[PDB]
Symmetry: D5
Subunit: 141 residues, 10 copies
């Protein structure tokens, strides 16, 4: 039924540590590679913003799995639509931490695509979330 | 906030699904969706569920997260999630439409109009086809 | 003289607003707006105000700055201000529509049509949703 | 949360406006705008102000309502207020540009480029001209 | 021959304009415009003229140069001049519409519809607003 | 009511002299700077092709004065419309004479934007006159 | 072949054209155009011809090449030649409409609607005006 | 992969019989109903013009089978694309014979959508074939 | 009525000689220069493909004279429409012989804009002919 | 009737050999050159994906011949439409084998234009097949 892209956000569980983030990256890369899924996970200011690209069914099944994870709560879908080609091609999953990135670059990128004084993905539109993640992916290459 | 959205998803009915089960689903959704500002429509046929929800980005997502935990269906597949200027499915907090209790010639034309399948197969339908199929049902009701 | 414009804004009615308040707002609004070439419509429901004003860029702005000084409401939020080819809200210099003095079902369906909320919440509505909500009310009030 | 918006307004500076008065304005705007997630640009020339603010619909409104109470100007005119997909005035929570301290030729050409007036007259300019005028100022900083 | 065009302009009527003045204008516009393949409509109201002319690029220009020389009005403003695929104002070489001989409420709402002004002020209206205002006048008073 | 552009053409009156041109350019520069008007005047093959940018009322009044000038006759308006920004920014008024340019570059420019073997602005559309003038202005 | 096309051209009647000439033109046109799959419409008025032919790119061209050798007119000028998705002038292999036998006011308004002229002057008309002019004449028959 | 529509044309083999047409119609109706396929068959002037809607795979497989039928030759694909909704809903396969309908209606229809003096789908674009088949279908 | 472009094709008459080609080019340069006409004539595979830009009347009359020339036959109009600017500016008439150019540049060009295994303008659309001719002109 | 493009896919019959491919390329190179046909053949993961550009009739007949070939089975048409210009100009027929290429560029190219974890033209849209083929043609010059 074709290639799709999903974008959703969520609130991280309190006290998340680096080993927790690395654990997410490690399982996501293996499962996604198996499932034909690509994407990117953005972490900052206690919030997750993720995009997954792939088959309509596979991406749905992965999202239903991600909802069971106790490392986050209060998930919101931002968008689900058919896409002509992938944007997030290179990584089965890439984690980007806004805190390990140039303070100035991120502030300008977060301002560019958002009205918020901090990283607040609930205040961004679907196209803003996409373009935010696209620039993170393009610089994190 | 963030605005009005519509979700469209499909799923498989669990084997043994009973009319009571159908009525229990409708009873709880109507109370919940009314509380949440959610309207929409549930189509059941050929062992398949095809549903749409309209409302707040967060609320619809939370309702979908709850629906994913229901054992009365399995293998849910998201069809689309996007922002909308206005609602189509205004009249009912949640309306159940059974394809089997309907004019066989009306439903045959409808299912053919918006799908390539010889029976009702939402998995073979695009997001636009599911929207238009459901809308004709809503209008016919 | 920069053409015809439309402003849309919303606000919270102040606690204790009474029918005399609504009449005073309408009485001054009709006189000022007729003087200023301003037309529009004010919607009241669920403790919220939703209003649109059409006219000259300077006049409408001046009318809005006066409105922000009015103690009969608070927490104003601008929804949209843009140039327009033609007016939609032609007939009245100002018209009050109370959502509660109307067919509950017609309004319930309209409030659902153009918003995600279980109640009248103009802060949850877009500029296009506010305009189309207001236009349908205007078309029914004729 | 109804998304990112841009406000543009103009006003007349009250007589006697002083250099310390402008610096005070710039000092409070940077603090307030940074607090509120707001960015923008203030233009001063020919006794007139032309400013733009980007950010949240509610915050920008509340900021305009505060600016309207300031005795250092009068006769404000809204030029446009609308939703935007991305910010243009990303770099400064607030920046002052004095047209009088700029190349008489660079500013004269820019003033003619975007208005029919022989002097700076933002009231004679469309929303698009004010935007494009302020943007070139922004790009020259 | 560069095709069909439309001109829209406005002006202030000179003080003391009389009904015979409007009649001399109308009798002469009809004869000249019929000769020159020009059609159009003149609106008079609130001491202001708002007129449109359709025809050949050169003919319309010359008629405007003639109109500019007339002492019966002053302070003309061009609102628009462009090529058009087809005429809107076809039925009359020139038709005069006086806003005062028409339904106040009909004209009132029409003037608000296409302008920000509390009275008829073509100087506050765009080319498109002027076009649409004149077109509704032309359509309603087909007589 | 915003920034507008006018383009018109005309026939020069027989006996046009440089002094004649000197008076035109001198009063135009003064008058246009006062009025917020910019533009360009093209002369060639006995024809004027002009563009003026500025306020709707000002540009019109200037056109009315230009129509009284006896140094030319048979004006035609080419277009009058609103514009987002000026193209002809640099000069309150600039004269360009086609005859004092490469017999090759202008031949082309003209042929590019007209069906005629000589400069015949009555044969050009509004968009052809604009682009033709924009190319001339862009050269200086 | 290479598709359905429409040609529109105009010409001046050779001075002294007679009714029998027009008859003979119409009789050859119906026979030839019917043989060649060509349809169209010929307007005559004020000493001018305005005609359109629809059909094969080759057939219409050759027929036009034959019309060019006819001494009953001169000064032919092509108005338009392009590919078309469907015919407008379907009903007749060739139909003659004389502007001289029509409601004097109907023809006056039609000529004014699609021309800057006080007389029928097809040389003063664009390709779209000729098309719309002939189409209205066709619809009144 | 979704709903598609195919259009193809061919020459009927010499000797085509009404019984021949009926075997085609009967086997097509059964197979297409099995295959979720709908469509329309046009026959005139010795030519076939057909459209099928359904699954990309299914429609292709049916076309491959049509290519082996000896009752026609010189098949030519006209169009194959994804479609949002079916136009040819009502019948799995419906035969419309051009030659036995109103002579004037089919003359106008065939002229409307083609440069030819007889039915010649080889002279028609994809859109012409589609709009032609659709007007036939709408008349049934 | 402004600037137009014509595109047409024809078959060269049997026996066409280089002097014949040189005379066509010679009279075309004079007539077109007088008539304000520019364009390009492409000769290949025994076929002519030409385009002319200029005034609507002049271009037509020139086409009518071209139709009486016995050095070619079977003319087909490809397209005739209004244009905003000339593409074939530099030359009142220029010959491009496909045979005197790189077989590979021309082979690739001919495939890009046609379904044919050789140069066959009768198989090309108006847009394909224009773009074909424009690439020749730009590389010329 | 102009230039067209066909795209189709099929399953290679079991046991396909290098000689098998050489014979396919050999006749296709000859036949397409005779027919004015250009195109490209992609082989990978036991699947064929091909495009042919040329005349509507010739391309159709070449497809009819290809369907009789027993070296593949289960052919599926992807798209057939008229085109303004060719994309695959340089070759009458060129074979590209995905396994004789860099796992990365092919893997990422294949992910770019499909949801699948391996090459599966059956899950690809018409526009994805075209773009997949076009990047292959562009790389192998
Ligand atoms: C924010 C977040 C994003 C995640 N994204 C993915 C993902 O994209 N793919 C994935 O396989 N698991 C993802 N996970 C982890 C799953 O929730 C879960 O732990 C994982 O799929 C375990 O899979 P298993 O049950 O098959 O072993 C994510 C978890 C979090 C908290
Ligand atoms: C096909 C299907 C559709 C459902 N749709 C909705 C719905 O629209 N809204 C809702 O509140 N529950 C819906 N449910 C039910 C949820 O799974 C769950 O039973 C419900 O939210 C229970 O709410 P509770 O928190 O009051 O127990 C649906 C269940 C199924 C099987
Ligand atoms: C919700 C609301 C809407 C209002 N709308 C208008 C209006 O459209 N026009 C107006 O003149 N005043 C309006 N007002 C009132 C103004 O704030 C102010 O009281 C009024 O202009 C005072 O007029 P005056 O000082 O000239 O007598 C509104 C007030 C409220 C609370
Ligand atoms: C032209 C002008 C522009 C201003 N722009 C801003 C601004 O962008 N943000 C802001 O907070 N204040 C701005 N101000 C200042 C406000 O009028 C006011 O002094 C400030 O919002 C006070 O905030 P407070 O309640 O924290 O004292 C501006 C004042 C002027 C005269
Ligand atoms: C508002 C106004 C509109 C006019 N419109 C026209 C017109 O459409 N056609 C026309 O010939 N004269 C029109 N005139 C009159 C001309 O100024 C002038 O008197 C007239 O063309 C004299 O024509 P004649 O000298 O060629 O006889 C108009 C005058 C006014 C004041
Ligand atoms: C072709 C041509 C173009 C002209 N353009 C302008 C112009 O752009 N601005 C201007 O003020 N005068 C222009 N003029 C001259 C005016 O017609 C008139 O002589 C001048 O405005 C008178 O200036 P004054 O009113 O100060 O005496 C032009 C004259 C000609 C012949
Ligand atoms: C204005 C005009 C329009 C004509 N239109 C057609 C036409 O549409 N079809 C046609 O066959 N002949 C038309 N003709 C006639 C041709 O010039 C020619 O005389 C006729 O095609 C001769 O037929 P033939 O092939 O038997 O010699 C027209 C002639 C004139 C003067
Ligand atoms: C013009 C024409 C159209 C046909 N269309 C169809 C068709 O739409 N569906 C179909 O199943 N067979 C169609 N056929 C018949 C096939 O060629 C073949 O006989 C049929 O699929 C046999 O099916 P079988 O597997 O049951 O033997 C058509 C034949 C012709 C000549
Ligand atoms: C393929 C071809 C193209 C021609 N192109 C032109 C042309 O562009 N301009 C032109 O004047 N003659 C052109 N001609 C020649 C005319 O047919 C005729 O010979 C020429 O115009 C001389 O006529 P004249 O001396 O009466 O002017 C062309 C001839 C052929 C065969
Ligand atoms: C995947 C695949 C692609 C093929 N592509 C072509 C092709 O593009 N052109 C062609 O002539 N044959 C192609 N063939 C081969 C034909 O099936 C047949 O072998 C060939 O056309 C020889 O025809 P002929 O010997 O009758 O002349 C292809 C075969 C396969 C398996």
């Amino acid at each position: 039924m074709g290639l799709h892209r999903l974008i959703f956000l969520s609130c991280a569980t309190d006290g998340l540590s680096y080993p927790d983030l690395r654990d997410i990256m490690a399982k996501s890369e293996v499962n996604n590679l198996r499932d034909g899924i690509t994407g990117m996970l953005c972490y900052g200011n206690g919030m997750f913003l993720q995009t997954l690209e792939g088959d309509r069914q596979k991406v749905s099944e992965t999202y239903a799995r991600i909802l069971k994870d106790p490392r986050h709560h209060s998930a919101e879908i931002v968008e689900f639509k058919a896409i002509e080609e992938r944007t997030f091609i290179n990584w089965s999953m890439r984690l980007v931490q806004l805190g390990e990135m140039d303070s100035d670059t991120i502030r300008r990128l977060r301002l560019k695509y958002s009205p918020a004084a901090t990283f607040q993905p609930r205040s961004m539109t679907a196209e803003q979330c996409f373009r935010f993640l696209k620039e993170l992916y393009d610089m994190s290459q």
